[PDB]
Structure 1
Amino acid sequence: LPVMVLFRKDNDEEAKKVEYIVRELAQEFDGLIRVFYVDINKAPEIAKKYNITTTPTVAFFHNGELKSVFTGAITKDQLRDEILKYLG
């Protein structure tokens, strides 16, 4: 399954909308993708590995490889279109 990972900071107002969007897509594509939520402060080594410095950031992985990274202003349509790409 393709994987979508939300990198988040705890007290972040814009991160709230992206977290809603990601959870919405997680349900919409349940069973077809896996979604993980990484707290930058609780897991700094993962954020460091993936060069995550701003939050919210959403990354996509497939076949154990990093495929794309979205930062800054993030929309549901952007994320959904990536999900569809890796589903075929």
Structure 2
Amino acid sequence: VLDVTKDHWLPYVLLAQLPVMVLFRKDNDEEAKKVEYIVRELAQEFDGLIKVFVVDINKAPEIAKKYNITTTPTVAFFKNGELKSVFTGAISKDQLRDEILKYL
């Protein structure tokens, strides 16, 4: 689990050979903290089968702008360069494993 830079977008994410789950957050949010723990847990559970990253849209707004992501927290699923699925609102750890498995 770690932040990603616009710089590191393509290499770390778009080039990643594993499926990628990215959390777009603003900062100093409570709901974002809760989603961030959910995602931490999913990353460790699926450690070495997917890759999981964070986008602090305060610092890398170009990434959200690129993917037309207007709400935080947002969880995005990227596989082989393309955006495969997006989850907003209330994020269900149960649903994220459902998808993580869908693309695995």
Tell whether the structures are fold-level matches, with TM greater than 0.5: yes
The Cα offsets for residues 32-87 of structure 1, whole Å up to 9 and x where unpaired, read as 00011000110010010011111000000111111000001111001111100111
Gaps of 5+ in 1: none
Identical amino acids, percent of aligned pairs? 95
Q: CA deviation at 1:24?
A: 0.2
Normalized per residue, the structure richer in strand is 1
TM-score by length of 1: 0.96
- Alpha-carbon distance in 1 for matches of 2:94, 2:61: 28
Provide the alpha-carbon RMSD of the alignment: 0.6
Compute the displacement of 1:14 (Å): 0.6
> SS where residue 14 of structure 1 aligns?
helix
Cα distance in 2 for partners of 1:63, 1:53 equals 23
Counterpart for residue 73 of structure 1: 90
Q: Distance in 1 between matches of 2:26 and 2:83?
A: 21
Q: 2:66 & 2:43 partners in 1: Cα distance?
A: 24
Q: Which runs of 5+ in 2 are unaligned?
A: 1-17
Query: Which whole-Å CA distance do the structure 2 matches of 1:64 and 1:86 have between them?
Result: 14
In 1: Cα distance, 2:26 partner to 2:61 partner: 11
TM-score, with structure 2 as normaliser: 0.82
